[model samples]
Target chain A: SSSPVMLAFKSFQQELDARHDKYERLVKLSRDITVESKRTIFLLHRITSAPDMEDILTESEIKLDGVRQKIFQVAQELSGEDMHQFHRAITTGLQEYVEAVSFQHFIKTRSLISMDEINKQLIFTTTWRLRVTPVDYLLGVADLTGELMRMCINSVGNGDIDTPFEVSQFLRQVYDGFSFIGNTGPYEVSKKLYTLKQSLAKVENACYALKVRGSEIPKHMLA
Target chain B: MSVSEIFVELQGFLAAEQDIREEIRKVVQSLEQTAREILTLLQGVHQGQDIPKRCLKAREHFGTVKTHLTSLKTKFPAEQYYRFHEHWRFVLQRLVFLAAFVVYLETETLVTREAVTEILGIEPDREKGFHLDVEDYLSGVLILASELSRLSVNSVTAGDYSRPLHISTFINELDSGFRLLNLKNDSLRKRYDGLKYDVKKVEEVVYDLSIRGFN
Candidate 1:
């Protein structure tokens, strides 16, 4: 069509068609990210109960690796610009995955997982090609504190007396880390920071109960 | 006695952090006035009748926002900056969105990255000081796409049928450019996802216009 308007319409139709095909593939990739990450989190949940936790984690890594290979395949298709478009879908998998991994690491060893440490575990397609973002890690860690709060309570019931104070101290550190983010972090992180404080308060109240009043356990939920 | 004492002592620390958060939000009223105007300016774009002047007004209100932001910069640094930045994010995002919208209205193209940094009056480089974020800039661009989609329909309603074609072309180009990016942040991606919705709204306008033979 020599007409410029018809030509623009044709061009627009072509791209719209292109996007039509792309959305299906996009939806599929996001579902895979969400699925495997959840599977990994569930597997990591087994850690708080398992006798041989490290052995379970070794299997857990295998689960996440399958997930990452899928992520890496999509990552190949989506290295830069494509990644940005699907970023929330992409990071939903990542932050959840990060929470599990950090929780696993913290559970086994009782330490915060650093960026370098997370980078070490990322499935590399090329030299330094893939890794977690600091914000995702921070968000994951924020979530990790909440998970830690849960585990601390469960372990207390399970007869692990020593874990609470250690969990409290670790959470305080995490709380301090989040606190330092001050006002400049993203909205979600700050939103999590509010829940984070509540988690801290609940944990503190529980710890206070366990210590100050040893005879009476609060029947009401702390967190 | 010994155990409660630790958290009892930690309570003081947590309260101080709480106080700082209170202060950040406490001062939010100071920003809420100017921030609300930025929303209104974008509100004007959503209405689409007075595009240029509304963008100009957005730019003007943003100047006061810059000064407000400057004092904020000096007031909070390090970790505190994160919380402060988080609260005021909506304010600056609108400022950047309108900045780019103003430029797009005048030039009929996207704003330069340097201009985005300049409009917010915040440095992008952390070495100079606390800076504007890449995600912020990208989200602002996404907001521009949304505004243009609304404008594409409004332009035709005003009997300027060709304007939708122009907007379709610009927005298509913008969408294609976005396709080339590798966004990774959660909020950044969420805002980017909304861009797809806007692109469709504009494309539907283009389609409606094309069928009407408005070329």
Candidate 2:
């Protein structure tokens, strides 16, 4: 008894409804992940520095390891049949996070060396790493950050209607953080941090969208 | 025509044509693959998958593509390569922007929905509206991408081959990208902001070192 247009609209609505449910489930999972990841990152910062200087580092490392275990457990639950895939994903994310942090540390430490001397030394080196060097890393990070943002955009586009605004706002905030360190690098660490900041912005933006839109979906239908 | 001249002409023609024909095909193929993967991940997020796997996959694909592009750069003369590299870089940059846009959309969708659900307590109808303003994020990403592409192009074109300038430009783009990201998400902004001064101080020191090296 429904017109074709009406039927199409109904189908669209149903799809949206389904997506809304999915969005909510994802949001909850992401929030948990964010908390754990944040803690991990903070711990990484602590441990990477003069370890003997702070007791917090020791405490944090212990806590972070626990958090990481929990994160893996949660990931396993979320992944179900895709446990290996999920684990790999988490590992890759963690690896990038660690690399970003490590690179930042390298740059910071090397900043003490004279740039002129470094540049002079670098000019004679034959490898591309000596030429393109940390710039490649920075570019790599930026590209990854952009990738994260696109994921958020797609989720919003799918029918989780509330997420787009929140995600956009979060992404903007992340970018602001990166701007604070704009374009000063020769050291690997600075370039890495810059990339990390940018990438985090992308992550935050995606999470913001998920959190805001997630609540509107029905719990029963989330599966 | 003399044999030597004829040989030189043929060699020149073949080299020019071969590079254009081969490189373009390679670049296009890589871009296509990247685009497909990115689109797939974006679509997957809507399907309720955690999508972390897709993200990882996309990142891997991008890294490979970048490496290929770098290799391609080395195969051509400075002038020819710069032009080819710039075009390909622009294409790659746009693809990355699109990919980032999708991720941002999905994340926002999840978070906003969660906030509303907490407030309602009762499950809302499956008809949840998690709206995202993708244009804003896309535009910001594009700006960063454009800057990076420009830097890459310029570095090659100028034949500066100087690593410091390359590093500087890249870092600047990364910083800008992060700044825009923080502006987008206030909650995550604070934690990142705490690291800002340290980042700045270190960069300044690096710059000083660079200057001293030049002297």
Candidate 3:
């Protein structure tokens, strides 16, 4: 009994609802990654600065290890295989950094710094060799994070309406935090990293915002 | 006292502390024995002497060593000796498997030494080629095992089970050490990779076993 006009309206509404659902899932994925990223950054900062950081690092290491496994599981659930090679690479890289730090501690503790000037010379030489050359490493990490954000945005645009471009912008802010560490050295790193932390909080807020907004769309209109 | 006398006194202290030292020594001895057995078996296979039988025998020895390690865990109480016991056991197991891996390479059973060294960054000598150092490998294993045990004990004592440690990182370092020593040796890389895979599998099993009872 429906008129052609009403039938067309119904189809349009169904499409809109589908788009909204897709957007929401995209937002959820971004939010989860953001949350874990924040935790990891916080832990890394603590590891570098705090005197009791060793204990905290150990705890964080455990948490991150579990997160790696969980991420693998989630990836498998979503894609039938792990989708984030970058994530695995970053986690493994971080683990190696921690080991290097631990080795440094052992060397320092052993009073092996005989020939102080020579030791200093050796340290400088080693540092130069191992240095990631601040600019390059920072940009590399930023590019990776940016790529992830762009992918999320693209997914939302491609019928994943729940995620939206705003989420991508928010993720970009988080990536900036990591880049800040490289650009300004560790000393000037806090504010940018803090902003990234705040952006993650905004993501959770946006999820609720979407839910509220989606609810107001009339059932029939949402089709 | 003379410096020599002082040295002798230090040795006496070490001898008197033999109970603890003995346990540690036993772990080392087991490692050496495992390494030798694996080498002998591999050499036998390379000479085309009952390949299947030797392989099976080597595999059985590895299994027995693993079982013995698990049983040895009971000697230490959880509160007092848990950390030391756990560490020594881990060291024992890793050394056993490392030895088996070296044997596999020497015998050319699984993969060539050249391939293993390439993949693992371990190079074998080209001229006047010498074998890999089992003692050095054991030493690295000891260091890793001790560190891991310390990390685990600290986690437990603090009643913090929310996070699990990344043992893979330590495993990777041990792999690197092995690689460094065998940098010129090419035939060892494939064998090392095979061992790395096996170690990963064994670690997962150990983690599962620990969780079931400890948790």
lDDT of 3 at B80: 33
Tell me the tens digit of each residue's lDDT in model 1 across A95-174: 77788778878867889879888777655644324567888888888888888888778777776667776787687667
Give candidate 2 misplaced runs (Cα > 4 Å).
A1-23, A43-54, A79-223, B1-23, B27-215
- What's each prediction's TM-score? 0.47, 0.25, 0.20
Candidate 1 residue runs with Cα over 4 Å from true position: A48-50, A80-83, A126-128, A213-223, B1-215
lDDT of each: 0.70, 0.43, 0.41
For DockQ, the strongest prediction is 2
> DockQ (Cα-based) per candidate?
0.01, 0.02, 0.01
Q: On DockQ, who's better, 1 or 2? A: 2
Give residue B74's error in model 2 in angstroms: 22
Sort all candidates by lDDT, best to worst: 1, 2, 3
Interface RMSD, all candidates in order, equals 26.9, 21.1, 21.7
Ten contiguous residues minimizing lDDT sum, candidate 2 chain B: B127-136
User: What are the candidates' C-alpha RMSDs?
Assistant: 27.7, 26.8, 29.8
lDDT of 2 by residue, B1-215 (tens): 99999999999998987877686767656665665555444433321245566666765665655555555544545335334443444444345455454343335211233332222121233322211123322333434333333222222222232432443444455556566652544433543454344345334434533443421
User: Residue B67 deviation, candidate 3, in Å?
Assistant: 3.4
lDDT, model 1: 0.70
